Amino acid sequence: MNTDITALEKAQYPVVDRNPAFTKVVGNFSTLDYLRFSTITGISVTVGYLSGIKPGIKGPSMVTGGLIGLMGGFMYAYQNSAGRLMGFFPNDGEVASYQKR
Amino acid sequence: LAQIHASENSKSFEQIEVERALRKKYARKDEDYDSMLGITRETPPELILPDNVLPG
Amino acid sequence: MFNLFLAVFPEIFIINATFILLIHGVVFSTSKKYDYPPLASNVGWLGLLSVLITLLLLAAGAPLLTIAHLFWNNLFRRDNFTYFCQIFLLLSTAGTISMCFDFFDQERFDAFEFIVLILLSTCGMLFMISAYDLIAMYLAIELQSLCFYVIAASKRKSEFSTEAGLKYLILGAFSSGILLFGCSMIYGSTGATHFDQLAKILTGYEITGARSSGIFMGILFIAVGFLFKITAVPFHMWAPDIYEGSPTPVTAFLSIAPKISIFANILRVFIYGSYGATLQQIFFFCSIASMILGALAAMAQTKVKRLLAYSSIGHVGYICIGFSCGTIEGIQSLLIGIFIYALMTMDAFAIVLALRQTRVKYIADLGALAKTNPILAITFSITMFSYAGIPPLAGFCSKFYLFFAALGCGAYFLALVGVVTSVIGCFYYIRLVKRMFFDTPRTWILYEPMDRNKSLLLAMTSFFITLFLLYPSPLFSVTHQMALSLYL
Amino acid sequence: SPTGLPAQTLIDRYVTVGAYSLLRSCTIEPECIIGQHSILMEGSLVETRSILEAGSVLPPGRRIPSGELWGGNPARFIRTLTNEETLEIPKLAVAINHLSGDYFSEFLPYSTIYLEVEKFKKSLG
Amino acid sequence: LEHFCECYFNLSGLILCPVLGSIILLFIPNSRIRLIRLIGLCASLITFLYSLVLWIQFDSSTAKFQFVESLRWLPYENINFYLGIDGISLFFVILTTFLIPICILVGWSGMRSYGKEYIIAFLICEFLMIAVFCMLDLLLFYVFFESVLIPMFIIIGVWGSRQRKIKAAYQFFLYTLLGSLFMLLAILLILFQTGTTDLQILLTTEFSERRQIFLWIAFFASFAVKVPMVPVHIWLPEAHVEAPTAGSVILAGILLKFGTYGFLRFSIPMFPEATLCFTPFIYTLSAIAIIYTSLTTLRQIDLKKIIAYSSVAHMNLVTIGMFSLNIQGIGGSILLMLSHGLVSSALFLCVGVLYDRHKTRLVRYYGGLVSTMPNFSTIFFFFTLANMSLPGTSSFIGEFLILVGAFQRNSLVATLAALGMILGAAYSLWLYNRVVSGNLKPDFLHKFSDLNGREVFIFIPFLVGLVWMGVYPKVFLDCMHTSVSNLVQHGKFH
Amino acid sequence: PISATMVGALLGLGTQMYSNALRKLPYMRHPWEHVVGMGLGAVFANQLVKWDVKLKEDLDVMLAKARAANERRYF
Amino acid sequence: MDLIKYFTFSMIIFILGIWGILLNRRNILIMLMSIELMLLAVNLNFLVFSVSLDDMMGQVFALLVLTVAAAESAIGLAIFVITFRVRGTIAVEFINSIQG
Amino acid sequence: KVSEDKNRNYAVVAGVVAIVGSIGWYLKA
Amino acid sequence: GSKKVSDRIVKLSAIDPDGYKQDIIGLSGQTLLRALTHTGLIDPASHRLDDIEACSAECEVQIAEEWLEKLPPRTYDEEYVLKRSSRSRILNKHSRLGCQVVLTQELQGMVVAVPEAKPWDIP
Amino acid sequence: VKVLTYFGMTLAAFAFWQSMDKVHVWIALHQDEKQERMEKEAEVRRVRAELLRKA
């Protein structure tokens, strides 16, 4: 299947890697990325718990909310990391690590 | 009448909480969704008054 | 390969979350161990969270939504116009969901599938906004429509809800068939379904004497389908009956989100394609008919929901006046009108859902509400004066344009219709203020106070309605951005 | 009720029921004043914009016609009310509600008795 | 361009005062009635004093707009709005700030049932009415004028005495909204030509005679409803009669002035050529309204209807003066506008004094009142004379000056307008005699109370103001003549 | 002066009081929520001001491109 | 004349659907079937045009419209069943309560 | 001496994690 | 007490949709609908006000011609409401809106027929 | 219907479709007159707008 990563709007920052691999983007996760991940997951677990009290399923509701939050937070962190590696988001740390390795 | 009033006034804190939750649980209904599930929710006996105090 | 799908991250997330909620609901609603718990509010809260996370993913990934645009080109088209339209659609859906928990708990509407269908229709409208081909447009429209048919009949033992669903399915399937026939004519005549190809084929010629009648009628039938979707007269009579007969949260949802998504489609199809005058005359004549008929029919109504339905018909007439003029300011004003009408309708339906706990049905039921709940009567009076367009409330903004275009595109009969129908609308809106403030009924209805969700939403929307004209710069700038991004 | 009508006790809006009054299955229509130490028996009806004096006794199934002042044991007609007197009845109800606002303001949503119960329990083991 | 002012007392603080009062009164419980009353009255009184200070620093040698301050809407600065006053609008700001505390004081006794809503409605009305008079922009003038409809509708409908207030409030709202809608069309047509709505720029731009005629017709459609001119004046008797007393005071004393103010601020200076063409048309409509409505007033049997109908004839004499387009006519028209807002307001206060006690407006029930309420009878006679334009009263100054200015242009219209001296005397004295003179009728009314301390005090500034203008109008005319002179000269260079 | 932070804090406090009043609760029921609303309103007003500034820049770039495309006509 | 003949075949089916709407004001089941006849005619249009233009896009869309038609029929008949179950009859006089 | 409800304790941990994470999110952006 | 509620009582007979006759009780000066809701013959929740502006003929009753002359003639608004709420859109000559019928002493013993309830609870 | 009725309606429909074939041939035969008439109406509009701009 022929592919093309080229975006409509060009990256406004140094392009460290045009099409970074999945594991490379995951390994690029920063402290802020983990903070976003953890915040989304914790809020989602909390909403699951609180909305589960009335039907009596606070634990299962907690697991469901936590799964939704885990998927959403991982997707958000991946979004940010890959955008930094691709030059779409401000990527000072990516460029500093790239110019050295 | 004295029987139902005496029964209510002598309940303990735990039983008061149990019956408050039950009263909230059975205050309204969705018999349509119940028929979809194929279940019949029944009023718990602790929320049913004896027939001798009912208007009929 | 994986990075290509960064352009569909919001949709992937919302669809997967919808599946998770479907499974969670069906697993624990059937559980004997938990005594078959009603899960409508639980899944509602989890779905509201899902919508907010989708909104976060979409708004924080603005440049990434245009990645791999050539690979994704034959499927959809994401740009700034779509970006802002989708953000607004997600916000509408979140507000509508937050307005449903009291209805779930007090009427004991226990079906969690309601939330699942709302989320699936939100997916469908998200795909509608980015649609860039007649095929994709039709598919997304059908997905949204099927979800609405099912939720319109959700109160399945009610005569009204079953009647609403039946009329919706028949008139909706009829209109969809007409629209599909138009797509077939365009394809047969041009050999093209992509919006870019249709643009290239149709620009520069319009009616150049030897006009393709196939193209012209494909356009006419597609326009008829769109006009049915926006409830423009004479394709409107499904709307008041479905709005009344559907459960009130369904009525609130159908009042806002589908209009945002269908107007996005109309812009990207017509404003962008190129048949020209006829297309705009269609919308001109339908706007006039909508304004007149909506004003008269609303003046005849005695029930709150019907009055709101006819008011929405009149206001889509006012909005479509903007599409008729076919200029940058026309598109900007259409978008501004849509945004303000959506916020006002959300205000009005928050109040209606609050009063539905004591079963409001007639306008006369609001008698002596200024005594029993004075701050609610003020909030509702503000909404009615805003609907009537009395400055400096937000409703004036849209009314101001109507006359600006009427004197810009050189149309004084439109101006006269606007003056007369505005006066009629003012009358039937201030009739509610008279009922709540001036009447002294013998029998009063005491209403239960609203829940926190609706009070917070009402407070925010009411502050917006009273104070928007003080700081209107962001909406003006963003709508100008969207109008420009339609072409560049 | 002996009158055959439904026997719920209905105290309508803007009604002032004077202290130490006994009501059993009676209807009070909106904007009435019931005098202190009054007795309204089963099925009795007080029509709107009426006033009863203190110490009145309304036997079962009796009626106080609208716009009138009654009193006695058993209650008897005294005089017809003027318009101003009838305009003053909802003002009395509103003023009493304004007073009750001051008492409502003295109570927070929860009490602190449970702390006293807790230390009473602890001082017993 | 930040055209902010260097004065300490400016228009923004005056506009903000009653708004702060309303915001504070939003959060006070309805059990603290004393506090609500005091705060409302004090806010209105401080606004009155502030406006008096604005009078004190007025500069009567300039034809420019004074105390001009700019208010910015967009950081693009394309649309930027200005506030300012001249000799034509200063006294109307003063009149608004003075009438509002009167409106609060009139309903003082019923304040335990009116509630804070009554005071807030009047304080909100004050803010919008002051703003309308202080606007240097067509668009803001339009937007602020319609804002008053909401609180006026509320005031009429909620606190009106009987259920005819429903119909009255509807008619008021619908007529006024129609008129304001025609003004909007003209504002948007002007904005299409000029690209602006700034009044000062419009006064320096040239219009074509064709488009001058058309835009003048569009302004007339709103102003003639406001004035009101025949045959679109029939909303007035219903609205001014069914309103509460303070509502009638605001409706007749301030709101009526907005159409004539709009003729002086926009139509007459901005379209000089069209104004000349429509001068026989305005003269005819005003003359008919004076003669016809004066005769209808003669045959009215409701106290408030006689006073309401008298207001129509007085306002159409104002239009004859302003369209005479000379110093006396325009000078007299402004003085009659101010005088009417004091005389008709005082007259609505006299009828309300009678209505609060006996609850009837029919003249047939009253009569003989001089033997039980001599204080009210004397005060009522004085404002009866002022309504007849008796020399020595404030209304005679404006009336005669308008007739002077009309005579120098067209002797026929000045002759028809002078017929109101005979007609206005006939219905004012017939009203006074049927209510005050004669014998009492104990079968209808037998219990009586003269004015109390609050009602006498209410009447004092009306007597002082009427006498002060009637004997020494120079303090007002001096501060006006420079603005009046330049309004007359606008559009000519010889 | 009148900063965005103060307008937003006042708006948020007013939003919490309005909510309490629409629910027939005392204006100051749950005061910690009044504090939370003040903070959220301040944050929202400041962010709206920043967003408006950014929007203006983006619009200027878009308008520049539109005018260039239009001026291309007369070449 | 091949293309015109296939086209008129599909067009007659579409017109028959329109007439079936027009002719069945007491028979709402036949109205649903008339809508299905219109949808079939549209599908035929897409397939014929795909052949005539040597283009595959008409066939892809024909398959997808098939999926949509099946979904519409399933939901439509479900609503018909619940309407009948509530009322006991399918007569049009029992589904006209909402009005004005 | 000890809070027994485990699901309640996990919910408490999640709420604390969300609060500290939001604070860190502000502090590092 | 010289003034009893029995002075205002009006005796009445209503026939329910299953054809069974019942003796109902009402007060003069109050509408026939109030007397009908006392026993639950008509659900009070379906017609809470006595206003023609809050009526979709949920209060409709059928009365024989002998009692129809003892009533004021049906108003234009009343006939409009009755006709539009009819399933066949046909005005029944013996139909009256129960909210617009005020009980008086001359209606003692009036016999009324209560048809099947129309649906009234809009979702 | 009777089977013979369905057969007869089919025969009538077959005749209708052959008539439609004749109509299609008639339309195809008159493309040239359509083209020649269109030549006039478009050129009249040209000579017209050109003359209307000479002044």
Ligand SMILES: [Fe+3]
């Ligand atoms: Fe009724």
